[PDB]
A = this chain, B = another copy of it.
């Protein structure tokens, strides 16, 4: 209560995306005055370039920070709970390596939630009867009742609608696209947009996703990566066969094979596979430098999707729906995330611009934190964030190679 919550003005940059919309929600819920909160985005909530603006994402419990608190809110929170579909979850593994690591995951996971090691092919087929007996020859599996999918875009849109009703201020397009912090004497006092509009506030959050490293100098702590996915379509008859099926994970990769209303199944590549290095000058960089900078999806449908991606996606379809191996993969697209070297979030005060805060480093697995992540960003703004989360999320330039991250390989560049 230096300025009270009630009188403190906050700009959330990227407020039409996952962490940003969460932040704004939690400001309002925390007792910030709605009209004192300004949401700026290049595109109206839900942002058409937001990684979160999807028909569905997969909600799987992990060890990761906040996984279980997020899960709870998806189940209990009155805004979020109509967007989570608890279907149960099945992690499948074939071979020495996968079954080995499935056994490691099981050990960790069974301490956190009920999970069920599935030894027989019969036990597997009872949890998901849409698999065939000889498809799953040699398979083990963890079944967990806890797990499902999230109507991701709908959830952000519901945040947007609540924030509008409460009187949050909004700026989109040229009035929303961040150009620079306003700095007076090492202190951030607001934000200028590309149209020259200047918004003054006590605190500024940059929750710009994969655009974060492109808007402000992040010293390569975050490296933006494109994650390709596509669609197959099933007839109503084929679709009906996948009624009541669970979410399925091949190691670290989740899928969901029950079609939407139009027969569509979204299948993702195994990882963010691709950078788009270009010479670029984020605010705070003395000179241009080679940074991975996203291509907007509200300005790049039908962009050259790497054939490698299409092949891993077809591999996964072959594994889990052999009868559908021949289905054409259409509406191929990329959404962008940004990796830290360690896979943890970057949620910290900027080390030079006081009252400018980073809330990014999503690392391609933060949609599920949408209910809760904004709470912790508010705690950060108020200087009450737990040291454990502060450390995990700290400013940490030169703490590792974000291009590789925790992933098996460095990402290949799209230019190639």
Tell whether, in the assembled complex, residue B301 and residue A172 are in contact, meaning their CB atoms are under 8 Å apart. Answer: no
Asked whether any CB of chain B lies closer than 8 Å to the CB of A304, the reply is no
As a 0/1 sequence over residues 275 to 298 of chain A, the CB contacts with chain B under 8 angstroms (1 = contact) are: 000000000000000000000001
In whole angstroms, what is the CA distance A197 to B234 when docked? 11
Instruction: Let me know if A175 is at the binding interface, CB within 8 A.
Output: yes
Contact indicator A195/B233 (Cβ below 8 Å): yes
> Counting CB contacts under 8 A, is A31 at the interface?
no
User: Smallest Cβ distance from A333 to chain B, in angstroms?
Assistant: 10
| A44 and B235 alpha carbons, distance in the complex (Å) | 15
Q: At the interface, yes or no: A410 with Cβ under 8 Å from chain B?
A: no
The yes or no answer to A399 lying at the interface (CB within 8 A) is no
Per-position 1/0 for A244-285, Cβ under 8 A of B: 000000000000000000111000000000000000000000
A162 within 8 A of B: no
Which one of A231, A263, A264 has the greatest number of beta carbons of chain B within 10 Å? A263
Please tell me how many copies of the chain the complex holds.
2
State whether A175 touches B301 (Cβ < 8 A): no
A173 in contact with B298 given A44-B262, A262-B44 (CB within 8 Å): no
Q: Given A44-B262, A262-B44, decide whether A173 and B233 contact each other with a Cβ distance below 8 A.
A: yes
A302 CA to B300 CA in the complex, in Å?
6
Q: Are A330 and B174 in contact (CB under 8 A)?
A: yes
Q: Is A170 an interface residue (CB 8 A)?
A: yes
CA distance A197 to B330 in the complex (A): 16
Residue of B nearest to A297 (CB): B301
A299 to B297 alpha-carbon distance, docked (Å) = 10
Selected contact of A331 from candidates B170, B173, B235, B328, CB within 8 Å = B173
CA distance A22 to B233 in the complex (A): 27
With a cutoff of 8 Å between Cβ atoms, the chain B residues found around residue A300 in the complex are 301-302
Could you mark each residue 298-322 of chain A with 1 if its beta carbon is under 8 Å from any beta carbon of chain B, else 0? 1111100000000000000000000
Q: Which residues on A are within 8 Å of B, measured CB to CB?
A: 44, 170, 172-175, 195, 197, 231, 233, 235, 262-264, 298-302, 328, 330-331
13 further contact pairs, Cβ within 8 A, besides A172-B262, A175-B262, A301-B302: A173-B231, A173-B262, A173-B263, A173-B330, A173-B331, A174-B328, A174-B330, A175-B233, A175-B263, A195-B233, A195-B328, A299-B301, A301-B301
Q: 9 A-B Cβ contacts within 8 A? A: A44-B262, A170-B262, A172-B262, A173-B263, A173-B264, A173-B330, A175-B235, A175-B263, A301-B301
